[PDB]
């Protein structure tokens, strides 16, 4: 039981899924040709005589990134119809990914996903990896998420997305896209883990001492966070945290489900011999502003609910000690209507290490997911960017030329504004 289905959309999601599936395979002893010389059930399906096929679906409206996987080292793992690919990409256009280029693939990926779900008996929820700033990852994911919400309904949809950085950006029309997809994440998602690339760059260059890191490193880090999230299904530990009880504890009001993820300890193998990475040390490194996966200041807001996912050699006594210390920190302030503000899941399996990675072999690890009001700041800056370009109606002819309206621009902006205001309001005390 306790299965889950992963949907990897767009190039960002497909590559993040490359990292994620390499990780799961190493974790469970499953070879890239499928064979394994139980727990694997949460991600893999046993196909006849020793063949564990991942419970995932790769999508792109473009052939290239999927072809890398078809010809890669993991060709014998995914079964051919799981890898769905189109002909021409959305080309950095929400309207293409959603309305014109998107409608041709949607029934195919939906048929595949339904065939995937008819094989699992305790489906927990969907994990959707994508990117806000892209064309496919924004529009086609909007479409897919709306359709999934109609069909399956009460299933929990968790999305892990690459939110656009403040200064470092790769595309020009990016703000536009990032706004329209918000109109979906409010309604058709249950918990949205936004992650910025600039923050992971700073994490790499400060912690792992990698001067020039590429997308593979960042994808390894995101994969590690995902593994830490679902370990409580895949392993046994002192305190397990499901997905439903996790969502019960982390989300106080329906609209408020945009927590921040942070993994620790992320150090190079060399500074690791000198560090005494106790439970307290990594527990505290989680609450530092520099170890954040998104560019924001936790000091600039108040926390609402935190979940600590400990992995490895962790006893409950020192967890209680560390949580009491954090409680006695004034730089870390909390809302008042959450007197107890910590969920604790403790797990036995230490974090596995991928060959060729930068992270070391450590015994204890923490994944902290914190619903803080400070995330509002992020949205703020992106909105400002929008209102620059939209003031001239720049690039809008591409969108309205593809089946869009301007009313949708206006509605998406009004929605993001109401979301920000709801965050600012929930923050305040009484």
């Amino acid at each position: 039981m306790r299965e889950c289905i992963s949907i990897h959309v767009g190039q960002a999601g497909v590559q993040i899924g490359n990292a994620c599936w390499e990780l799961y395979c190493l974790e469970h002893g499953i070879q890239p040709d499928g064979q394994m010389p139980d727990s694997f059930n949460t991600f893999f399906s046993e196909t006849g005589a020793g063949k564990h096929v991942p419970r995932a679906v790769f999508v792109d409206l473009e052939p290239t990134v999927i072809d890398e996987v078809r010809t890669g080292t993991y060709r014998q793992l995914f079964h051919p119809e799981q890898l769905i690919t189109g002909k021409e990409d959305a080309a950095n256009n929400y309207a293409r990914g959603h309305y014109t280029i998107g409608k041709e693939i949607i029934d195919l990926v939906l048929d595949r996903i339904r065939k995937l779900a008819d094989q699992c008996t305790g489906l927990q929820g969907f994990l959707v990896f994508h990117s806000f700033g892209g064309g496919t990852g924004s529009g086609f994911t909007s479409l897919l998420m709306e359709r999934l919400s109609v069909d399956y309904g009460k299933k929990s949809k968790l999305e892990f997305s690459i939110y656009p950085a403040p200064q470092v950006s790769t595309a020009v029309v990016e703000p536009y896209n990032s706004i329209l997809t918000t109109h979906t994440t409010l309604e058709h998602s249950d918990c949205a883990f936004m992650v910025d690339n600039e923050a992971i760059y700073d994490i790499c260059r400060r912690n792992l001492d990698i001067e020039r890191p590429t997308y593979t490193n960042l994808n390894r880090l995101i994969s590690q966070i995902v593994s830490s999230i679902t370990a409580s299904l895949r392993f046994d530990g002192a305190l397990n945290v499901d997905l439903t009880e996790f969502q019960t504890n982390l989300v106080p009001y329906p609209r408020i489900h945009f927590p921040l993820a942070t993994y620790a300890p992320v150090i190079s193998a060399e500074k690791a011999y000198h560090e005494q990475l106790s439970v307290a040390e990594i527990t505290n490194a989680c609450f530092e502003p520099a170890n954040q996966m998104v560019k924001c200041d936790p000091r600039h807001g108040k926390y609402m609910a935190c979940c600590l996912l400990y992995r490895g050699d962790v006893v409950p006594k020192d967890v209680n000690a560390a949580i009491a210390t954090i409680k006695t920190k004034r730089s870390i302030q909390f809302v008042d209507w959450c007197p107890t503000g910590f969920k604790v899941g403790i797990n036995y399996q230490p974090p596995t290490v991928v060959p060729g990675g930068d992270l070391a072999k450590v015994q204890r690890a923490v994944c902290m997911l914190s619903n803080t009001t400070a995330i509002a700041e992020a949205w703020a800056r992106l909105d400002h960017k929008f209102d620059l370009m939209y003031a001239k109606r720049a690039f809008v002819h591409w969108y309205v030329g593809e089946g869009m309206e301007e009313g949708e621009f206006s509605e998406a902006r009004e929605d993001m504004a109401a979301l920000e205001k709801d965050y600012e309001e929930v923050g305040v005390d009484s």
Binding site: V396, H397, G401, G403, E406, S410
Partner: protein, 183 residues
């Protein structure tokens, strides 16, 4: 020339511009497409559809229902090209019949309706529709008022005088309306 955005809107109301019904023919809501004066300073294709369809319908009825039969309302993009190619050719013909009195029509002005270049075409279009109805509703004994208006005078005193005559006519005729509807 701010009055160009002004007289246009007034002349827009001159043809009887009702922002509601003329938005109702397109099957879309008003809240998503603003009308009025400050509507074509930026790219605004919906207000473009609406005003252009009203302006082409006010001048012609049957041929308008013909050339815009497979187009209006151009909600999709395959049928949009029909609108953009049925309107551009007509505007080109209209500009070629008048010549220097019109801006040269370019299809590129229709890829993004906005900026002063679109407002210029729109004002001269409104002038043309006004005039070709002053050519038909003015009496056969007064058709010269049309060409008297096409006579591009250059002296200000005569312009003053012409306005003067027209405005006294305006006062007297609006007063006679009251006499007829009350008595």
């Amino acid at each position: 020339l701010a009055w160009q955005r002004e007289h246009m809107w007034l002349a827009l109301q001159g043809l009887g511009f009702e922002s509601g019904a003329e938005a109702a023919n397109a099957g879309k809501t008003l809240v998503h497409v603003t009308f009025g004066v400050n509507m074509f300073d930026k790219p605004n294709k919906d207000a473009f559809y609406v005003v252009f369809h009203f302006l082409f319908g006010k001048l012609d009825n049957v041929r308008c229902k013909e050339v815009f039969r497979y187009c209006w309302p151009p909600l999709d993009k395959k049928r949009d090209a029909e609108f953009r190619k049925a309107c551009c050719e007509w505007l080109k013909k209209i500009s070629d019949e008048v010549g220097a009195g019109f801006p040269q029509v370019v299809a590129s002005i229709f890829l993004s309706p906005g900026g002063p270049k679109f407002v210029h075409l729109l004002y001269h279009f409104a002038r043309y529709v006004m005039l070709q109805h002053i050519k038909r509703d003015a009496d056969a004994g007064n058709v010269f008022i049309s060409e008297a208006l096409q006579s591009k005078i250059q002296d200000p005193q005569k312009a003053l005088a012409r306005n003067k005559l027209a405005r006294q006519k305006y006062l007297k005729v609006l007063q006679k309306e009251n006499l007829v509807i009350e008595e």
